Design a protein around this ligand. Structure first.
Ligand SMILES: N[C@H](CCC(=O)O)C(=O)O
Ligand SMILES: N[C@H](CCC(=O)O)C(=O)O
Ligand SMILES: [Ca+2]
Length: 314
């Protein structure tokens, strides 16, 4: 009946003679009470995906219209129209997310839109393959991904999912909002109320994105960014920059909208082909970058959300 298989200490597959996989199994058994043989069966099926390693390497750390090209990948009639459909379909969850977390529908709709086109593109790679590959055959970020794999397996166990059935991005991101295992653990919420946190349930995803935003400092009703009149070619730009409003004014900029009580801001510069468009980046813009560290990403999420909000009014 019961087969302990104590003598089966060697697994097959792509990670068969991998020291990192062996150490990982030992950690899961010692730290979390996993059964070595059960874990060996799972990992013997895990695949080493060279494409994952190559993409992770390809992303390792004008005016020619850079922003225009990025923007048009997300802000198109088809995308905006689909965003309207998603918003209307899940309006109750979105409104409830606004009330509980203070994060507006346009922001959540923009995030889910840029991330997966509202569930249309959620990834085709088995999460286990991606995470095992990055944990066992990628020294540069082996520690970060081993932590993600550990959390992934714990998530599967708790939510009673088969670790091998879940698919997502090349980095192991999952569902509507493309949450990493660590984000599921720290920020995902059962917004649908059925007692289970499912990253593939749009209602849960909506609440999880909102909670993620509030946890990262989103200020309800605060401005995201304000476009500037003027140019500031001398000053370095990017979402990580920081200047007092006085410095920016001295550099030749004026806000198109009142900045209120804000005394500092980041200097954002968008390449609009004919020249540059400067913006005063406010705290909420930086909060968007906490989801994906990119000025273009944050601006696309925000503007996509605004475009959908407007298409809804019509
Ligand atoms: N994506 C991270 C970027 C690290 C960073 O520059 O903060 C990596 O590949 O390590
Ligand atoms: N899509 C980005 C480039 C676009 C941009 O952010 O300017 C990439 O894969 O590198
Ligand atoms: Ca749920």
């Amino acid at each position: 009946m019961v087969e302990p298989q104590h003598n089966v200490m060697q697994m097959g597959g792509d990670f068969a003679n991998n020291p990192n996989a062996q150490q990982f199994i030992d950690k899961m058994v010692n730290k979390h009470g996993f059964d070595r043989q059960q874990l060996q069966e799972i990992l013997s099926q895990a695949k080493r995906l060279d494409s994952v390693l190559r993409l992770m390497d390809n992303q390792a750390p004008g005016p020619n219209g850079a922003w225009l090209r990025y923007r048009k990948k997300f802000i198109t009639p088809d995308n905006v129209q689909n965003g309207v459909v998603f918003w209307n379909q899940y309006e109750d969850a979105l409104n409830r997310a606004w009330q509980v977390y203070g994060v507006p529908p346009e922001i959540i709709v923009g995030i889910i839109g840029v991330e997966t086109r509202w569930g249309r593109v959620m990834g085709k790679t088995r999460i286990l393959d991606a995470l095992a590959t990055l944990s066992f055959n990628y020294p540069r970020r082996a520690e970060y991904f081993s932590g993600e794999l550990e959390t992934f397996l714990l998530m599967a166990r708790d939510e009673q999912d088969d670790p091998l059935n879940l698919k997502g991005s090349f980095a192991g991101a999952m569902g509507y909002g493309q949450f990493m295992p660590s984000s599921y653990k720290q920020y995902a919420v059962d917004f649908s109320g059925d007692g289970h946190i499912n990253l593939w349930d749009p209602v849960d995803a909506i609440g999880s994105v909102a909670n993620y935003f509030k946890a990262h400092g989103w200020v309800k009703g605060d401005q995201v960014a304000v476009m500037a009149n003027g140019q500031a070619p001398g000053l370095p730009n990017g979402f990580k920059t920081k200047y007092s409003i006085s410095q920016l004014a001295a550099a030749g900029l004026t806000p198109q909208q009142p900045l209120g009580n804000h005394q500092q801001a980041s200097l954002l510069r968008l390449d609009v082909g004919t020249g540059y468009q400067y913006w005063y980046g406010l705290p909420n813009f930086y909060t968007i970058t906490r989801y994906n560290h990119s000025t273009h990403y944050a601006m696309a999420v925000w503007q996509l959300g605004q475009a959908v909000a407007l298409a809804r009014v019509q």
